[PDB]
Symmetry: C3
Subunit: 450 residues, 3 copies
């Protein structure tokens, strides 16, 4: 049986006090609605009907590449009215799952269990037990089936003690949705067409409604403000960290670890406190990440150690390389195996060959450095004024003395030696030794003003 | 009706194992007693009577500027004796609130509710419910009024089950305080004059004592050691973070956020984990603060992004500026709109004009830099030996080549160009190009010792 | 009465998904088994019998220096079989305590209370109360003595409600262990010889088994995976931080503090959030450590302030020194009293004399710097190519101008002055002023390409 999803995402999110619409606020670096779209995709949804409204232009720019059907809602008249906007696109013989852009932690596993329980021509309603169910619609089960969702204000004393409550998440076939949505009324205090009413309509038609309990409450929780969003964030981070720990990643403190994307890892990986992993990150075996590192879109080979307070982005690090502390790898930094990058070093769009070292107070930009080079402290690759970021090409086995400026476009051939304090503007030949001729004034008996 | 406060702050705080007296230990960067003084001020207190004793000289140096009446207590004979020291200064027709220098989280809101409930010629006693009230004085209410505070050792089985306990915080008029304090005795195991006894004395005089429950237990908790102080700190930090989140500040992790002063913010502000905000900080709209930043006494314009591990102090940052990662702004750094400050860059008491860039391994101190300047990597402003920190004045549209030393006092005029590796000691004229003439020795066939 | 310990440490730890055996995973920087060995040593154990098996070679390399008896177990046939491997080495008249390499938080205090309760020719069994005891062996006490350890699958309804459970930790004399271990059978579902059976065997012999409740559950908890290991880590860190706070160390956030070794401290020490203390660290009075610092094997004198994001290792810091922010002290850095080390500064195997300053973008390696020296921004000590890390010797009261390279081996005598941008290769005499003679090309009317 086929499946399609409807995601409610039209909300303004007034209590976020933001220029963004509600569902664009992020959880682990990606919009709340994107988590829901990805879950619906993971489920095998043929179509994903996205109900949107407030901040329409921002929704379109931030989610331009999502394979969704854009259903523009002009008036907020309740959740049944929102779902009915997508109803002309429902296949009669497909299942439809209703999800909420502001409740991002719903899992594929929970939803699979919900779809599976759906009786033919009936509804599968996602429910949850609360220690304090006050304010939520109570689940009334008679003969194993859901006969009513009794709201707080209507419940009798005995019903107020029911801990099982309605989440809003439900599954039914497209024909049943089309049929029942056309029958929902707005005769209530809010004057809204509630999707909740489908339970009563299904019962009127002698169709069964089966309840399916969610594993965690946090899967059904919605974020109405940034405090609630921060609580979903911490729950999501704890869950990601716990999964990594059970896979064998040594995360020293799961409460001080953040994953905002995907992590591929080998065995015996050690991650110290306050590390942030962003985008797509791949770590080989025995990678050690020191305190305070930020890795965004990087590939790290086996046996690499990243020392504290290193920031890496869009970079590749070969096996047994040693980075940090206080190293900065900017996009395009490609470090070969057994390389060394030290404190207060910045590498940008440069390749560094096997065994080469760049250990102090250096800027290497738009360069190619060969194997077994020694880049002295204070070395800087630079350009002439008005240039267009030209390249510095350094061969194999080159020594570059401390505080040397390499003025691109320039080539330094294999085995060349450059003395400290040099300004390199002309190409250096193979085995060429280039040393600066200094002129100095020496004044004897110079008594300091102390 | 007028109000004045009495704050007990004479304690040694032996269990802090410190040379400081008890109340000078800080919560969110300010002494515990200062929080209480500020609360009493926010309430509208005409006078704030500060009872002090231990570490008297340190109290005077650390709180020199507080608008308090210094009441030096020579002997610790109990809380009623402490309050009686200030009693000759109470106005008969004013209300007096008794507060504790070591219980800093008491709120203005709680105290307003306490003052309001105070019956004429009576007492308003602040109380709190505890799940485990063991050791605390139980509130005995008869005919809605507080008839007794029954201590742990005296309570009957039924009274030990009372969860409502005495906090020590109370309000009464100045004449009633003067009258009842003169009647407090010390006939008890400790031989102390307890302020607690005022409840029994008020009852003897047929004056009503009304109980007022505190909203949070943490408002009445006192810190006797640094473990307790750390628990008040975390509660205070969580409360500050929660308020900011409800105002619309996106704090990624409220458990990894510290505010030690005041924060003024615009909309869509994003604060990553492990950020510290000190003194008075103002952030405009859409300010993004990366992980590990420290902002102390700074003004940050709209649309500024501060990248990870940046430390800013007594600085101003114009709109759309980009700072970090690993940037250091020291006092007097003034960055104009659309400026760029990069990694391993230190700016001290310098103004940097619109669109100017200082992106790598640079020290700029006591300087004025104009608009659209390019400050190369490794550039350093310096002085002669025995100098008195002279100024470097750089005009508009100046290019300063990498690893150039600018020797103050020096002026570089508009549109000047400075080549890499230069030593600037003489003023550079408008559109003047200054390039270093290098002498180099080139030795061919130099085989490295590898 | 003498004591010896047996520690079970043969486990593979399959669920760690690691190449290391189970007990080598660390808690606070040291292997789980090492914590247990140290506890057994603190107790006064004459012998420590270490049962090992999986990852035998790694156990031997990682614990080479431990004063233990290496008992190589070839087959895992249950805990009684493991303890019996060490039994030929038990003295009849000594007490034997059985401990587990994967339950590292067991305290000396708990074990002292266990040994003390041991009745002659009997057993002292360590027990613990659990709110949910499901799955654990229930303690059956009859006439004050332990008559049985009833397993989950055998317990009657009434016995399942017993909250007191078996921990596996026990004490008995060597003769009793030898005797009872020879009588343990493997007739059970697992076909293993359980140490648990010693309780039933002691009862058969009319020897009393006394229960001793552990203070904390976490002392008896074992780590089977890295999630469980992380929970023991956080509990251990919280306990260490709480002890330090009660001793008077101001730890701003005990949940963001890590101690991985030993800390000796004076009074009025302040430690900001996210600090890591490794190896042996000693702090004097009024030491202030800013956010994000890492101190490994360092001695810090009184009144030192370490500013944020400083990494120190195998270094000594004299009184009133000022370090950071962003300073790096590498092994052998020895800073005398009243010295100053600033941002983006790296000190390696160098001594820096009293009052000397190294405040910006500098590398000082293999050097001796005297008193009251001024090391300018951008200064670098370096070597010739093929050198063997030679020394830079700087006297007292030397000024070294910004962006100067000091080419070791070189000596700079007392009161010498070095101008900015200099290359020092030759020794500088007492009171010698060395300034660079620059040649520059000046081109007027150079219009920039803007
Ligand atoms: O109803 C919406 N979202 C929604 C619905 C239900 C819940 N459920 C709960 O929070 C919940 C339920 C039961 C127990 C605990 N929490 C959480 C969020 C909704 C409606 C229209 C919208 O447009 C949007 N949106 O995302 O903008 C959300
Ligand atoms: O009594 C003092 N402080 C004080 C008094 C009461 C409390 N209250 C509680 O801790 C409390 C009460 C009820 C329930 C929970 N906590 C906390 C602190 C006091 C007295 C003399 C002093 O000199 C100082 N001081 O600040 O140095 C404090
Ligand atoms: O049994 C072993 N360890 C062990 C034994 C008991 C416990 N106890 C508990 O976890 C416990 C007990 C009671 C209540 C709560 N937790 C924890 C760990 C064991 C046996 C053989 C081994 O070789 C190793 N090891 O360390 O590799 C451990
Ligand atoms: Mg330099
Ligand atoms: Mg230079």
């Amino acid at each position: 049986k086929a499946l399609s999803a409807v995601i409610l995402a039209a909300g303004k999110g007034t209590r976020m006090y933001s220029d963004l619409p509600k569902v664009l606020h992020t959880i682990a670096g990606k919009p709340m609605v994107k988590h829901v779209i990805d879950t619906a995709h993971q489920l095998g949804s043929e179509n994903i009907h996205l109900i949107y409204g407030h901040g329409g232009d921002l929704m379109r720019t931030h989610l331009a590449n999502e394979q969704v059907n854009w259903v523009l809602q002009t008036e907020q008249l309740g959740t049944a009215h929102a779902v009915q906007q997508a109803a002309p696109f429902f296949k009669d013989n497909e299942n439809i799952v209703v999800l909420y852009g502001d409740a991002p932690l719903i899992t594929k596993e929970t939803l699979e269990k919900l779809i599976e329980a759906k009786p033919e021509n009936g509804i599968a309603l996602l429910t949850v037990n609360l220690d304090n169910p006050t304010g939520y619609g109570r689940i009334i089960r008679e003969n194993g089936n859901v006969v009513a969702i009794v709201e707080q204000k209507d419940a009798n004393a005995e019903q107020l003690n029911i801990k099982e409550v309605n989440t809003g998440v439900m599954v039914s076939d497209g024909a049943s949705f089309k049929k029942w949505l056309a029958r929902v009324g707005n005769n209530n205090a809010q004057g809204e067409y509630y999707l909740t009413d489908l339970i009563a309509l299904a019962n009127q038609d002698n169709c069964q409604v089966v309840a399916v309990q969610a594993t965690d409450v946090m899967e059904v929780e919605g974020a109405n403000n940034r405090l609630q969003l921060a609580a979903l964030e911490r729950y999501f981070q704890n869950k990601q960290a716990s999964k990594l720990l059970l896979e064998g990643v040594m995360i020293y403190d799961p409460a001080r670890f953040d994953l905002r994307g995907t992590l591929e890892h080998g065995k015996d990986v050690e991650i110290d406190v306050n590390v942030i992993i962003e985008g797509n990150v791949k770590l080989g075996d025995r990678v050690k990440i020191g305190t305070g590192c930020v890795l965004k879109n990087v590939v790290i080979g086996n046996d690499v150690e990243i020392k504290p307070y290193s920031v890496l982005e869009d970079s590749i690090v070969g096996e047994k390389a040693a980075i940090g502390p206080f190293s900065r790898l900017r996009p395009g930094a490609e470090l070969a195996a057994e390389t060394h990058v030290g404190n207060f070093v910045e590498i940008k769009k440069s390749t560094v060959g096997k065994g080469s070292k760049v250990n102090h107070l250096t800027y290497v930009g738009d360069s190619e450095i060969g194997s077994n080079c020694n880049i002295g402290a204070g070395v800087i690759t630079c350009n002439y004024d008005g240039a267009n970021k030209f390249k510095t090409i350094i061969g194999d086995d080159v020594f570059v003395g401390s505080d040397t400026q390499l003025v691109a476009p320039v080539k330094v051939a294999n085995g060349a030696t450059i003395g400290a304090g040099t300004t390199i503007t002309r190409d250096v030949g193979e085995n060429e030794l280039v040393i600066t001729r200094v002129a100095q004034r020496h004044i004897q008996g110079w008594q300091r003003p102390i």
